[PDB]
């Protein structure tokens, strides 16, 4: 620490996390890019969104990969498809994973997702 | 209530003293506020000093008449003696005091030297165009200090004349006690009764 406008305090740090607004949770729930994609765009991480394509690198689910269904900002999570529990009655339920573990593989693009890469200082689309 | 062999104290704590207590926790933090205030003022003003130039003055009473001290303002007689008006002097960084008087030739000279030393060393920029800046000196007291006048001759002659300093004080003190009645005793006997003769 050096500047006087930052609080090295455990109570204030956790309060900012748990009671964050919906827009601010977009920046927190991020995920790193793969070693293949890191050579293309030259960016280490981005905010994770709805229609993606992702690989689980840690935990019990690691090895599998699938498509992202919805970014659950309320619970700090991201529901990925094909990562489910089949209950005793024969009903599928999605399992939640924190996106810091998850790794992005084939980025979804719009106008602003291209311009986001240009802003950070990255080549290509 | 009392009784061993202790000194009789005087503690004035029978009012609601706890409601009106102050603890100076701010001492350390309040120092930085003043250093910040002195710095930020110099940035606004820029090439001028923070202090006004003050004169040399002698102190009152028997206890402090043997020492000199920085006064308030330069008087109207001394400002005239150097060669300038009182209204002009206020904008050059020279303090003026309309109520202080002069009854001493020694203090009169000292402060005329102080003004001539000030006027020579300072520079003045015109209102119109060019302004060749020359940094800022903050304290006027640093460049123009106060020195104690020397009335000393270290080695000196020993001129005795059998007068006795102790005997001089006893005679001089006796005159102050008795001049009242000695005037009135002379106003009788020699005057009034004998002026009638």
């Amino acid at each position: 620490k050096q500047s006087l406008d930052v609080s090295s305090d455990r109570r204030k740090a956790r309060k900012a996390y748990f009671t964050a607004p919906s827009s601010e949770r977009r920046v927190l729930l991020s995920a790193p890019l793969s070693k293949e994609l890191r050579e293309q765009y030259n960016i280490k991480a981005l905010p994770i969104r709805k229609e993606d394509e992702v690989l689980v690198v840690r935990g019990s689910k690691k090895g599998q990969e699938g498509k992202v269904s919805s970014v659950y900002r309320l619970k700090f999570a991201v529901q990925v498809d094909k990562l489910t529990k089949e209950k005793s009655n024969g009903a599928s339920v999605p399992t939640n994973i924190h996106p810091s573990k998850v790794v992005i593989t084939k980025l979804h693009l719009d106008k602003d997702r291209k311009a986001l890469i240009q802003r950070k200082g990255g080549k290509l689309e | 209530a009392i009784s061993k062999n202790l000194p009789i104290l005087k503690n004035h704590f029978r009012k609601h003293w706890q409601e009106r207590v102050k603890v100076h926790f701010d001492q350390a933090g309040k120092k930085v506020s003043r250093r910040h205030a002195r710095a930020s003022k110099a940035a606004k003003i820029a090439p001028r000093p923070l202090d006004l130039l003050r004169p040399v003055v002698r102190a009152p009473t028997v206890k402090y008449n043997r020492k000199v001290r920085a006064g308030r303002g330069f008087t109207l007689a001394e400002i005239k003696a150097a060669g300038l008006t009182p209204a002009y002097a206020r904008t050059i960084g020279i303090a003026v005091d309309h109520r202080r008087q002069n009854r001493n030739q020694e203090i009169l000279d000292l402060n005329i030297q102080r003004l001539k030393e000030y006027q020579s060393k300072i520079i003045v920029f015109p209102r119109k165009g060019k302004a060749p800046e020359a940094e800022q000196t903050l304290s006027a007291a640093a460049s123009f200090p106060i020195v104690q006048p020397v009335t000393d001759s270290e080695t000196r002659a020993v001129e005795d004349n059998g007068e006795s300093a102790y005997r001089t004080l006893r005679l001089a003190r006796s005159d102050k006690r008795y001049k009242g009645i000695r005037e009135k005793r002379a106003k009788d006997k020699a005057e009034a009764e004998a002026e009638k003769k």
């Binding site: 090295s8 455990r10 | 207590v21 603890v23």
Partner: protein, 260 residues
């Protein structure tokens, strides 16, 4: 706070009704009306001798007494017995009163500073301040005191040409100017002898700050303190030659058991 226990309005029932006396809450219709208050033994009562702001926090100390202790701490920097007893892996180092060249003063980055400590005779002392790092036992865990770790070496210097910026991010290393230099850094935990790393200009300046016989001081009306005894070695004096040659012989240390 104040006004903590005083907020409720309550007075005692007194004698007649078989309970204690001691102030009880007025008669509403809750599960509270009837309960006690105010007294230190009561639930939601007053604290006995409640803490106030105007207690004595800081302590005044004499100016000469600080400079006596600070001077003795700089004597403790040398002498290898006190340094090893007060932690510090100083087995490798060639001698102590360790001085380094003034090229150290113009270091820029950490990569330069870390390589310097290896070549001089340290880094094992910095590695100690790395394995060390563990959690607290008390309640500093949730009061912004979440980890401990031990102290490293000190780097003393005269002039600044980027020395503080380089050694800032090193785990255990602290820095200090010679002109300042207090008791806290030299003898932390009230134990003498920290492993100091002096520079050439810093080491040469010490005669100009404190003083010697012919050299003055610079501090206003200060000279170094003289000791009661000249030389600490008493065993040399008792044996010596002049003292021992005078007196009668010993009585074989330990005596017999008599009248058994």
């Amino acid at each position: 706070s104040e006004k903590a226990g005083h907020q409720t309005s309550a007075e005692s029932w007194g004698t007649g009704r078989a309970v204690a006396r001691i102030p009880r809450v007025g008669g509403g219709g809750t599960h509270r009306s009837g309960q006690a208050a105010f007294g230190n033994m009561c639930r939601g009562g007053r604290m006995f001798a409640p803490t106030k702001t105007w207690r004595k926090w800081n302590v005044k100390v004499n100016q000469n007494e600080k400079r006596y202790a600070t001077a003795s701490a700089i004597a403790a920097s040398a002498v290898p017995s006190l340094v090893l007893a007060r932690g510090h892996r100083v087995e490798k180092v060639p001698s102590i009163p360790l001085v380094v060249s003034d090229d150290l003063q113009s270091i820029q980055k950490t990569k330069e500073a870390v390589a310097a400590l290896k070549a001089v005779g340290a880094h094992s002392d910095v590695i100690k301040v790395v394995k060390s790092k563990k959690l607290r036992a008390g309640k500093g865990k949730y009061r912004n005191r979440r980890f401990t770790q031990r102290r490293g070496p000190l780097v003393v210097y005269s002039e600044d040409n980027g020395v503080v910026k380089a050694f800032r991010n090193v785990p255990g290393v602290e820095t200090a100017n010679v002109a300042s230099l207090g008791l806290l850094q030299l003898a932390p935990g009230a134990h003498l002898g920290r492993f100091v790393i002096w520079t050439q200009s810093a080491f040469s300046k010490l005669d100009q700050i404190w003083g010697s016989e012919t050299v003055a001081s610079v501090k206003a009306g200060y000279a170094l303190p003289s000791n009661i005894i000249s030389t600490s070695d008493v065993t040399r004096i008792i044996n010596s030659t002049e003292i021992q040659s005078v007196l009668r012989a010993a009585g074989q240390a330990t005596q017999k058991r008599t009248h058994v």
